[PDB]
């Protein structure tokens, strides 16, 4: 019997990205070698199988710093973090391999799928 | 130059509602007289002008319990909290006045607008 506001989910995501920009209520730092990225644990868990596993673990849920595998590319992580908060993926010939490898590690299935398709089209 | 995943924002919201259902990483209790509602501060701020003002205040941002005005109807609040996490508003003849009054207090402009329109259609 409900009515639905079509734009509500995108409006919520836009506001969560505005909170991230202003560093409001961010509760974790993701460290990717020499780079640091502040974020909201809930958004990360909502977008990534890896973060869902980390922040549901009874010990790791309480950490304020998470260090990723040294093989992870910071630019690839940055592109994926932007996608989590905006639905837009900045996929380019020069970053697709790093984005795909990062999305595989983060367990972001739809991103991995589009990367595979864009690579297949070139070869 | 980005590509966009159409369903991403709705998928994020669905996962945030699943976290709320399972009481995962909820960080505030909203008290509406005899009722309590657990939620995520970020989602509340993303949906309500009142919660945005509360959780950006340097003292109130740190409270784990927020008590609403005693005039606020718990069912109306519950319906609006469900709308925040799902984009679906359970508006009925028997609850529209309480939902509209609650949405005015919470500063949820689009909800107030649809309530006004449904009331105008009856009178």
């Amino acid at each position: 019997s409900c009515i639905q506001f079509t734009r509500h989910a995108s409006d919520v995501l836009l506001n969560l990205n505005r909170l991230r920009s202003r560093d409001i209520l961010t509760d974790v730092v993701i460290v990717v070698s020499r780079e640091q990225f502040r974020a909201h644990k809930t958004v990360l868990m909502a977008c990534s199988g890896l973060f869902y596993s980390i922040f549901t673990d009874q010990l790791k849920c309480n950490l304020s710093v998470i260090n990723l595998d040294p093989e992870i590319n910071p630019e690839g992580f940055c592109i994926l973090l932007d996608f989590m908060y905006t639905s837009r993926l900045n996929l380019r010939e020069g970053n697709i391999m790093a984005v795909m490898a990062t999305a595989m590690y983060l367990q972001m299935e739809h991103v991995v799928d589009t990367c595979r398709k864009f690579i297949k089209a070139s070869e | 130059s980005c590509i966009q995943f159409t369903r991403h924002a709705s998928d994020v919201l669905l996962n945030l509602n699943r976290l709320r259902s399972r009481d995962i990483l909820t960080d505030v209790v909203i008290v509406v007289s005899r009722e309590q509602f657990r939620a995520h501060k970020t989602v509340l701020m993303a949906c309500s002008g009142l919660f945005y003002s509360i959780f950006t205040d340097q003292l109130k941002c740190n409270l784990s319990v927020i008590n609403l005005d005693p005039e606020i109807n718990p069912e109306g609040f519950c319906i609006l909290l469900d709308f925040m996490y799902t984009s679906r508003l359970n508006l009925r003849e028997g609850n529209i006045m309480a939902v509209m009054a609650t949405a005015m207090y919470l500063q949820m402009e689009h909800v107030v607008d649809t309530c006004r329109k449904f009331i105008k259609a009856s009178e």
Binding site: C2, I3, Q4, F5, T6, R7 | R88, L89, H110, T114
Partner: peptide, 5 residues
Amino acid sequence: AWVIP
């Protein structure tokens, strides 16, 4: 906006 879902 509002629609019947």
